[PDB]
From a paper:
Ryanodine receptor type 2 ([name]), an intracellular Ca2+ release channel located on the sarcoplasmic reticulum (SR) of cardiomyocytes, is essential for cardiac muscle excitation-contraction coupling. Structurally, [name] is a 2.3 MDa homotetramer consisting of two functional regions: a massive cytoplasmic region, also known as the cytoplasmic shell, which comprises several regulatory domains (NTDs, NSol, SPRYs, RYs, JSol, and BSol domains) and the stabilizing subunit calstabin-2, and an activation core and pore region, which comprises the Ca2+ binding site and the transmembrane domains. Dysregulation of Ca2+ handling, characterized by aberrant SR Ca2+ leak, is a pivotal pathophysiological mechanism in a spectrum of cardiac disorders, including heart failure (HF), atrial fibrillation, catecholaminergic polymorphic ventricular tachycardia (CPVT), and other arrhythmogenic disorders. Here, we solved the cryogenic electron microscopy structures of [name] variants linked either to heart failure or inherited sudden cardiac death.
Author numbering:
A (entry chain B): 2053 to 2315
B (entry chain F): 2 to 108
C (entry chain B): 1207 to 1316, 1414 to 1854, 1889 to 1929
D (entry chain B): 436 to 869
E (entry chain B): 3666 to 3702, 3710 to 3858
């Protein structure tokens, strides 16, 4: 008789099409076989779905809806090039998220929605846009870094999730160190918050990332500050302003919760 | 700067007063004769409040001078409609708009 | 068909209507020309009214040479006969015009000086009649778009004119308005001094005052007596009518004289303040021709005429609305039915790419641009393009994508970005959810059921252009989703039945053109989730009747579909699987 | 040659340059599609390697220098005056080949298209020139498609130049393709470019084709044919009436069309002249017809407002009286018995006139032709005769479609050829000279 | 058709071997189909050997031997789930020293003159990990501190034991049966 089930119907149809004719479209072949694998792997659907499943009380429904709307605006801004108005949209959305109570009350839902990933790559785009010509939209990097530092401070598991991006954050560590008033709002500050007061993360911190910071500090000690001499500051041979910022991260890496991490 | 020509007569008594909503179907054409807007295309009447600056001045004055059930032609000079900047993408700078407006209902 | 000849032509859409097919044509294996056509074949006939079309490069009688303007010479366009003198040459008056018109002002006002040239609105072009060409056979001046008069014998007295005289209540004519399609003068009468043309070709100078609508002509440096006054907003095309008495006939000269603007400065908007004369490639000579086809409408207005009585006269009645989409060519002030683009390839290509540009400028949530585009492409035009069966395939696919991009793509993407996340509230509705609808372990129809998981909110804005508020620029423009649902279901139901017969006349010309836009729109609507209950049941029965039957006919899954259609059917099946996964998750949370 | 050395002493390798420019294009020719997948991949890899080596050796700037030094001459004649005649002949071909080579060198290569950003500004500076527009457009299209950095440096001036290219050079779908690539690249939308393109192209409504829905309009006329000629037995004054039983102002989104008046024929053919058989055109759109819609006098598709007591569009229960005087060309109207302060005068009379009404869906009108056919609600003006008095003594007056083709079954549709001239309508007794 | 799609994707020009969920799932499916895995009788052992040969033939008759080499070559020496899945499938089709598969694999390499395959093998060997005493000590310090373990087995020390074993088992299977030709080719 008939398939009587969507799974059986799809499993029959895909094989029937493929054995009926040779498909010239790689996209069609890929879609057909993905669909067939989904029909034969129904357990994997639940395996993928459940980690992204969250339950909330009825009282938090409107707050969750507002948070999801803000997250949707932020996600949709990924597909457009950054400009003056996108700056405003990004900032107002991040502010609404921080003001919402669900952001604090449910860190697991925030981690499952991957807000840190979205903000991370949004800042990645801006950082990769125009490095030599000095970073554009510095207020964006500041707001993204403040959001990420708050995300780290909310929960210990969030700090571990942010720790996985320490490599790139240390690569883009010289973004706005020389610029004042951005203190606490730089990727280096995000990296420091990713390891602040966590023995588990301090011990997992490797050698090469420390070597990167050491090399940056050596460069700051050997060479002057280009942006400062451009503004007219006297040309000393070394860069105290960036050196101190690089030293703070090493402080946070070596000293943790009152005792000194020997490793 | 608005002169109104009557296409169909109305009651001639129930003019819009301050603090009312006017329900109209309008069809806007440029002076050359090209349509740029029409509420009849959207099939759903346009409501605006008298004196609350919701619409352009030319349309406001024309609707105020019209009466209930009257179909009239409204010609708005570029000083009472979108000035010299114009509406981006729709109305060019310094354009005279012609409106076919019917005052369906006053509420 | 010859003079006073009447004939009827049968394509055999209905076999019974063929009188002699059976006696001769059925057994021989010949097929009727309309054996597998659901809709009537379009009739094309020879156009009666001549139109202006560009002079072909392969023309047997006309040659056009575009002489470039030097430092001391203005750009010129020369018209000559390649076949003059030889046999088969045609000695008839031939009507020439320039492609772009000069538009007069909307409201009439009540060493050359550079400031005068910048504040002036007078434009000039001149025509050189080469020595040896009879000036009496050459006419120079301006014509409008209405000129469709092809007469072997042309005289200025025979032009079409009318005088509208609006008067006061008493009856005194306060104003009289002469309106005509031709404003031209003859060179033979312009030859006033005499013997001044044999030495050097005569030059009529045409000056148009776009601010006042005054058309005056100068010949050999002296103003002629004839002058024409036109009404505001008149679009005037430069035109020369000439009967050739020489291999070389005349020459369009696009120069300027003192205190007057060149013709290009009025023709083109970018050159509005450029005193240097120019002849851009857009400008070209056109001639009146009869080699054009006309498309008989598939459907006509139904009009009933009858004599009610002796006193009541003859009754003319028409109550059924009919409506067609008109495509307007801006430069030529012309308009053609969009279904005539089936045989006009260049316009079809340009319009398809224009539709693609429309879909691209409002891409990825540009709601302000979408609102602006709602003025150019309207709701009635979108619906008519969606439902029309004679639309060209390219335009069909363009208009479907334009509708989706302007009204639905934003919310479709909003729901697709949040499809893999399941934030289900804990309420009584959530508790009521179960894996299976009843005691029997029967799967319910996918989609149909109660879903409590949080989903993005759908909001739309009314696209009005009289309001001055700017809060409308968030949210995409509103559209009648109910009408869209009903018509989408209707057209899918029709298409499944029609394509199953493998008719030779699919909508758009190909099965891909018939199905890909329709299934894409249906998939967008399904993603948006507008379909509810009975509509979903019917459209699932359309996809597969037997499997989704609720407790022969072939569904979409078994019709020998093209690959692009197969890909979208795979997408629909993927969405149904996602719906099942969501139902399972919501039932797990209910148990928990 | 630029520094004005003798043309004879200068060695200009025209033939060698042309041959090397053709061989180079063949060398950078993209792989064909029908080839096998592995072979196509190998050819693509070789092409990419060649492009990388050329750009690392800086062969792009060499081609740019050749192009720049060739655009100093305005035209082939100018180049043949400065250099030799053969050089002038080959100038255009060499310019096209150089642009084709540049496009082949940068096509499909992200690094090359990113390196060409600095030269993009210099490239669009010569877009208007007719000898380089196509090649420049192709190079611009390749760069915009491949390199996201190009869109970051394309500015409002460049977009406006590309748009004015459409206005000066006519409709070209390649410009539209370039403009589409300006908006979205690799799935990322440039909102500034989108806004600039919209605000600089759309509002004009003068370059792109415009679309609109128009209600179908039909016309119906009586059998009579009224004409004036010297020595002809036809009365010059005529009169008829039309009353509207019902009319719906808005049956669709567009206004209902209803116009009444007189129309003429071209020459002596019974076929109405100057207008399309089908479409949205009615009484007054052409110069062969004269109309009145209750507010305007229509002729030649231009409408002028005419005064009248209690002006209104044609409503239900409106009696319209049309007067035609051929002795002195004059068409006058009277609405509901009151005169309309306006008339058509001094029109062409070398044809046959007939009553006509144009309409769209949603009407109910009745011809009052006088006599047995209809009764006049108002007395005709003195002199004017009812229109039924012009029927030939053998036929019957009836109201039929002005145009030949109507709504009926396709296989029963009567196809009509050209009709014989209706010269017998005007009876001029020809004298037999004696 | 599926194997042909996977082979074309590998042969397509890319700077990096992108992770493909479809490939990483269907390669596992094919490997499990291949292996399908109290003294047994000689007849029982022979039936098992013949069934394994048929199961391997169902794939290498359709071009899996070429695909598992093309994917490794396209990997360009980058360890990843795609490479692990390819190596497991290669082992599955090569179990028992399948001479037909060995001959197909050598003939393809000799005909195509593939250098990327051997370069990728060398890169994977260099990227293979060993014991890390410093990481072991750090994990011991963390465990003695009292914090919960993220992974029970301590995957940081000896990063991937399965990948290295599979990579070298693939090479051993290539040379089994005293396959002198391939032994010299390596």
């Amino acid at each position: 008789k008939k398939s009587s089930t969507l799974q059986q119907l799809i499993s029959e149809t895909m094989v029937r099409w493929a054995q009926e004719s040779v498909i010239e479209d790689p996209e069609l072949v890929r879609a057909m076989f993905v669909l067939l694998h989904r029909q034969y792997d129904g357990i994997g659907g639940l395996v993928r779905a459940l980690p992204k499943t969250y339950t909330i009380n009825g009282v938090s429904v409107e707050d969750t809806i507002n948070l999801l709307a803000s997250l949707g605006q932020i996600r949709s801004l990924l597909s457009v090039r950054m400009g003056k108005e996108e700056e405003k949209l990004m900032i107002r959305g991040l502010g609404d998220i921080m003001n919402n109570k669900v952001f604090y009350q449910h860190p697991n839902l925030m981690r499952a929605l991957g807000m840190h990933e979205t903000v991370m790559e949004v800042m990645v785009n801006v950082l990769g846009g125009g490095e030599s010509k000095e970073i554009t939209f510095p207020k964006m990097v500041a707001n993204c870094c403040r959001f990420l530092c708050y995300f780290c401070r909310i929960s210990r598991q969030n700090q571990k999730a942010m720790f996985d991006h320490l490599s790139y954050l240390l690569e883009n560590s010289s973004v706005g160190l020389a610029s004042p008033a951005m203190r606490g709002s730089t990727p280096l500050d995000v990296a420091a918050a990713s390891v602040m007061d966590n023995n588990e993360l301090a011990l997992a911190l490797r050698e090469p990332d420390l070597e990167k910071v050491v090399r940056y500090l050596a460069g700051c000690g050997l060479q002057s500050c280009q942006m400062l001499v451009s503004k007219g500051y006297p040309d000393i041979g070394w860069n105290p302003v960036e050196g101190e910022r690089y030293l703070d991260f090493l402080r946070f890496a070596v000293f943790c919760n009152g005792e000194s991490v020997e490793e | 700067g608005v002169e109104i020509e009557t296409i169909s007569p109305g009651d001639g008594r129930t003019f819009p007063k301050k603090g009312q909503t006017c329900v109209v179907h309008y069809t806007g054409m440029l002076q050359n004769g090209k349509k740029f807007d029409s509420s009849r295309d959207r099939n759903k009447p346009f409501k605006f409040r008298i004196g609350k600056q919701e619409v352009i001045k030319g349309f406001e004055e024309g609707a105020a001078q019209m009466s209930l059930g009257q179909r009239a032609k409204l010609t708005c000079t570029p000083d009472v409609a979108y000035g010299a900047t114009g509406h981006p993408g729709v109305i060019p700078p310094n354009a005279t708009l012609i409106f076919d407006v019917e005052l369906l209902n006053l509420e | 068909l010859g003079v006073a000849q009447v004939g009827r032509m049968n394509f055999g859409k209905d076999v019974s209507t063929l009188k002699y097919f059976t006696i001769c044509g059925l057994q021989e294996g010949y097929e009727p020309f309309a054996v597998n056509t659901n809709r009537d074949i379009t009739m094309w006939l020879s156009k009666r009214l001549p139109q202006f079309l560009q002079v072909p490069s392969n023309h047997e009688h006309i040659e056009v040479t575009r002489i470039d303007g030097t430092i001391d010479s203005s750009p010129c366009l020369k018209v000559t006969q390649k076949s003059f003198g030889s046999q088969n040459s045609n000695t008839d008056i031939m009507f020439y015009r320039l492609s772009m018109p000069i538009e007069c002002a909307e409201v009439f006002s009540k060493r050359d000086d550079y400031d005068f040239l910048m504040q002036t609105s007078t434009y000039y072009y001149s025509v050189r009649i080469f020595p040896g060409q009879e000036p009496a056979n050459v006419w120079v001046g301006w014509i409008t778009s209405d000129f469709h008069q092809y007469d072997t014998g042309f005289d200025l007295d025979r032009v079409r004119t009318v005088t509208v005289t609006l008067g006061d209540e008493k009856g005194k004519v306060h104003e009289s308005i002469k309106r005509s399609n031709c404003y031209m003068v003859c060179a033979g009468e312009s030859m006033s001094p005499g013997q001044g043309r044999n030495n050097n070709g005569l030059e009529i100078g045409c000056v148009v005052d776009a601010a006042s609508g005054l058309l005056t002509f100068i010949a050999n440096g002296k103003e002629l007596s004839t002058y024409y006054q036109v009404e505001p907003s008149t679009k005037l095309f430069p035109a020369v009518f000439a009967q050739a008495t020489s291999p070389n006939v005349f020459q369009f000269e696009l120069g300027r004289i003192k205190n007057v603007m060149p013709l290009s400065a009025g023709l083109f908007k970018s050159e509005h303040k450029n005193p240097v004369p120019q002849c851009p490639p857009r400008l070209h000579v056109q001639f009146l021709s009869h080699v054009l086809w006309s498309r008989m409408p598939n459907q006509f207005l139904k009009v009933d005429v009858s004599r009610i009585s002796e006193r009541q006269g003859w009754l003319v009645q028409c109550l059924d609305p009919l409506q067609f989409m008109s495509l307007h060519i801006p430069e030529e002030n012309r308009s053609v039915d969009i279904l005539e683009l089936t045989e006009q390839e260049e316009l079809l290509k340009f319009h398809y790419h224009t539709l693609r540009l429309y879909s691209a400028v409002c891409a990825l949530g540009n709601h302000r641009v979408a609102h602006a585009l709602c003025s150019h492409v309207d709701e009635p035009q979108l619906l008519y393009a969606i439902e029309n069966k004679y639309m060209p395939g390219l335009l069909r696919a363009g208009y479907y994508d334009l509708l989706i991009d302007i009204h639905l793509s934003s919310y479709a993407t909003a729901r697709l970005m949040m499809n893999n996340e399941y934030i289900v509230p804990m309420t009584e509705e959530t508790k009521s959810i179960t894996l299976f609808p009843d005691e029997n372990k029967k799967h319910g129809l996918p989609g149909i059921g109660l879903s409590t998981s949080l989903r993005p909110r759908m909001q739309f804005s009314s696209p009005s252009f009289v309001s001055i508020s700017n809060e409308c620029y968030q949210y995409s423009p509103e559209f009648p989703l109910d009408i869209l649902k009903s018509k989408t279901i209707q057209m899918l139901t029709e298409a499944v039945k029609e394509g199953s017969l493998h008719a030779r006349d699919p909508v758009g010309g190909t099965t891909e053109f018939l199905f890909v836009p329709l299934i894409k729109l249906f998939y967008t609507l399904l993603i948006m989730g507008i379909f509810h209950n009975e509509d979903l049941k019917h459209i699932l029965q359309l996809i597969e009747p037997s499997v989704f039957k609720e407790a022969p006919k072939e569904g979409l899954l078994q019709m020998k579909l093209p690959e692009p259609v197969k890909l979208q059917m795979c997408l629909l099946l993927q969405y149904l699987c996602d719906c099942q996964v969501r139902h399972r998750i919501e039932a797990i949370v209910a148990f928990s | 040659l630029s520094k004005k050395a003798k043309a004879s002493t200068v060695d200009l390798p025209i033939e060698s340059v042309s041959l090397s420019l053709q061989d180079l294009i063949g060398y950078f020719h993209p792989p064909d599609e029908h080839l096998e997948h592995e072979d196509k991949q190998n050819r693509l890899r070789a092409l990419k390697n060649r492009q990388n080596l050329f750009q690392e050796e800086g062969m792009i700037n060499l081609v740019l220098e050749c192009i720049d030094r060739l655009h100093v001459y305005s035209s082939a004649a100018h180049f043949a005056d400065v250099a030799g005649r053969e050089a002038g002949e080959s100038w255009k071909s060499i310019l096209n080949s150089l642009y084709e080579l540049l496009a082949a060198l940068i096509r499909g290569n992200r690094k090359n298209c990113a390196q060409f950003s600095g030269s993009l500004d210099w490239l669009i500076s010569r877009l208007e020139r007719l000898e380089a527009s196509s090649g420049i457009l192709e190079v611009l299209h390749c760069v915009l498609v491949e390199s996201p950095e190009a869109l970051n440096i394309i500015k409002e001036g460049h977009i406006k130049s590309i748009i004015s290219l459409l206005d000066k050079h006519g409709r070209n779908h390649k410009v539209l393709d370039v403009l589409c690539s300006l908006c979205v690249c690799h799935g990322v939308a440039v909102r500034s470019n989108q806004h600039l393109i919209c605000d600089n192209l759309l509002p004009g409504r003068d370059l792109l084709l415009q679309t609109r829905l128009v209600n179908h309009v039909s016309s119906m006329r009586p059998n009579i044919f009224l004409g004036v000629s010297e020595g002809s037995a036809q009365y010059k004054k005529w009169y008829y009436e039309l009353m509207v039983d019902h009319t719906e102002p808005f049956v669709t989104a567009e206004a209902t069309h209803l116009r009444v008046g007189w129309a003429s024929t071209e020459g002596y053919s019974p076929y109405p002249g100057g207008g399309e058989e089908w479409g949205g055109n009615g009484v007054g759109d052409d110069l062969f017809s004269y109309g009145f819609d209750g507010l305007h006098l229509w002729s030649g598709c231009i409408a002028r407002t005419v005064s009248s007591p209690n002006q209104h569009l044609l409503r239900t229960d409106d009696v319209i009286s049309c007067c035609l005087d051929l002795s002195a060309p004059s068409i006058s109207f009277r609405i509901n018995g009151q005169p309309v302060q306006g008339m058509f005068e001094n029109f062409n009379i070398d044809g046959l006139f007939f009553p006509v009404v144009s309409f769209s869906a949603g009407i109910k009108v009745r011809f009052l032709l006088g006599g047995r056919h209809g009764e006049f609600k108002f007395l005709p003006p003195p002199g004017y005769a009812p229109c039924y008095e012009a029927v030939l003594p053998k036929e019957k007056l009836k109201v039929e479609h002005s145009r030949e083709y109507k709504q009926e079954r396709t296989y029963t549709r009567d196809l009509l050829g050209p009709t014989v001239s209706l010269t017998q309508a005007a009876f001029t007794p020809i004298p037999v000279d004696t | 058709q599926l194997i042909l799609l996977f082979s074309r994707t590998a042969l397509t020009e890319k700077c990096k071997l992108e992770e493909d969920f479809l490939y990483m799932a269907y390669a596992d499916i094919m490997a499990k189909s291949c292996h399908d895995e109290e003294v047994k009788s000689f007849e029982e052992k022979e039936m098992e050997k013949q069934k394994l040969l048929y199961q391997q033939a169902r794939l290498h008759d359709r071009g899996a031997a070429e695909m598992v080499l093309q994917t490794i070559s396209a990997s360009k020496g980058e360890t990843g789930p795609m490479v692990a899945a390819t190596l497991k499938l290669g082992i599955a089709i090569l179990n028992g020293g399948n001479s037909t598969v060995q001959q197909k694999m050598l003939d393809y390499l000799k005909e195509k003159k593939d250098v990327g395959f051997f370069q990728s093998l060398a890169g994977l060997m260099q990227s293979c990990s060993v014991l890390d005493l410093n990481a072991f000590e750090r994990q011991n310090k963390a465990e003695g501190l009292g914090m919960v373990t993220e992974e029970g087995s301590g995957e940081k020390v000896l990063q991937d034991d399965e990948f290295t074993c599979d990579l070298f088992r693939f090479l051993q299977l290539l040379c089994e049966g005293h396959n002198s030709d391939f032994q010299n080719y390596l």
